[PDB]
Amino acid sequence: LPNGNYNIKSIFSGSLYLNPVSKSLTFSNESSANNQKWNVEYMAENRCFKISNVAEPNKYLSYDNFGFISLDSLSNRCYWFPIKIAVNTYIMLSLNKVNELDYAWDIYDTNENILSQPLLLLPNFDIYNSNQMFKLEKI
């Protein structure tokens, strides 16, 4: 996964884009703004990726003590371990085991509708959970 700026999308929708809304992360209508742009940087020492918001470049995708993905300053919670499962489809694990499991970005859907859902961090067991699949589109 090359370094650079990406849009981030759920496989449930090709027209909804990851952005912060208050302290949550959600997928929204295309804005063409910096807040839908994500700077992916590989970290050689731990073989993971940190992912910062272009609009707020000192804030990274992280997670809180409540099960939500968040946008925070750098910490070991900001390291993501992706599993590429298709062209530019990924499962995004936290680098750290959480509650001694793999945990992954997870977006809840109601009949494939994700509007207004917050992105959460939930257990991962395999590569087939649709709610854990995300598109990284270079742009």
């Binding site: 208050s22 949550s24 409540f66 099960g67």
Partner: protein, 286 residues
């Protein structure tokens, strides 16, 4: 078809002195008010198997507990019957507490932020911060309430025990005496209340069916007497007014002898009639 349409208070297992409190669209956690600001009607939708939680606010009558998805915030918004306004009420058996999960995303449940005094969300875990006590508002208001009890025919009079040794019960003018105050206790098992007189450690208001129609207080370490127990029913469209019916014989309401607003008038039971010497004001002693 058990909680549906019930008006309840909701308090925190992590802090039983904090209740869900609503003012102008804002939901917080606040001490007990015994008024509509902390009352909620549970409105069941049978096809969703989930509930709307609706504020009994007398000014804005259409506000329901709402998750402001995708944020961490909970507020009250106009009822639009939206998924973010429905909640699964999951009773944790053995614990007698509830988890309250969002219908819109059942992985997320209410979390009591007791330091911030407001509501948040969390995935499920074992902490007390996601457990809640849901109680019929009358029980909630009266349980462990220390009150004074007045006939509506003379508010300045009061049901009293006579003294620490004379365990008889008569009417007398309010003088703030401990013999004139009652700590109400709800017994979840018998689904009824007892009135503990505060001049005794274990003296409770007891219908002495033996001498027919009369009422004294006596020891509460007599264990299985269902005349030591009472039912309290709100007189319709009041705030403080109730009927008090005895457990052993629910036709037998607590009665002010003859309607006589006078000192020393006997307190007894009589057959129910909805008639004014059988209505009572239960209030905080000023």
């Amino acid at each position: 078809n058990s909680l549906n349409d019930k008006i309840v208070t909701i308090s925190c297992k992590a802090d039983t002195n904090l209740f869900f409190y609503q003012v102008a669209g804002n939901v917080s956690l606040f001490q007990q008010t015994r008024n509509y600001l902390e009352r909620w009607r549970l409105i069941y939708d049978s096809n969703k198997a989930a509930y709307k939680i609706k504020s009994m606010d007398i000014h804005n009558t259409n506000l329901v507990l709402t998750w402001n998805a995708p944020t961490h915030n909970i507020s009250t918004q106009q009822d639009s019957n939206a998924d973010n306004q429905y909640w699964l009420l999951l009773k944790d058996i053995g614990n007698n507490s509830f988890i309250i999960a969002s219908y819109k995303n059942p992985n997320l449940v209410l979390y009591a932020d007791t330091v911030a005094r407001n509501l948040k969300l969390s995935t499920l875990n074992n902490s007390n911060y996601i457990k809640f006590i849901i109680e019929d508002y009358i029980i909630s208001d009266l349980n462990n309430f220390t009150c004074k009890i007045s006939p509506i025919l003379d508010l300045n009079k009061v049901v009293q025990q006579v003294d620490v040794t004379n365990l008889n019960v008569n009417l007398y003018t309010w003088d703030y005496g401990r013999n004139q105050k009652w700590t109400i206790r709800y017994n979840e098992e018998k689904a009824a209340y007892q009135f503990f007189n505060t001049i005794l450690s274990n003296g409770v208001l007891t219908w002495i069916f033996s001498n027919g129609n009369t009422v004294r207080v006596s020891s509460s370490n007599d264990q299985n007497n269902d005349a030591q127990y009472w039912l309290i029913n709100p007189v319709s469209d009041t705030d403080e007014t109730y009927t008090i019916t005895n457990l052993r014989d629910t036709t037998k309401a607590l009665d002010l002898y003859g309607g006589q607003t006078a000192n020393g008038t006997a307190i007894q039971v009589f057959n129910y009639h909805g008639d004014d010497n059988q209505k009572w004001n239960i209030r905080n002693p000023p």
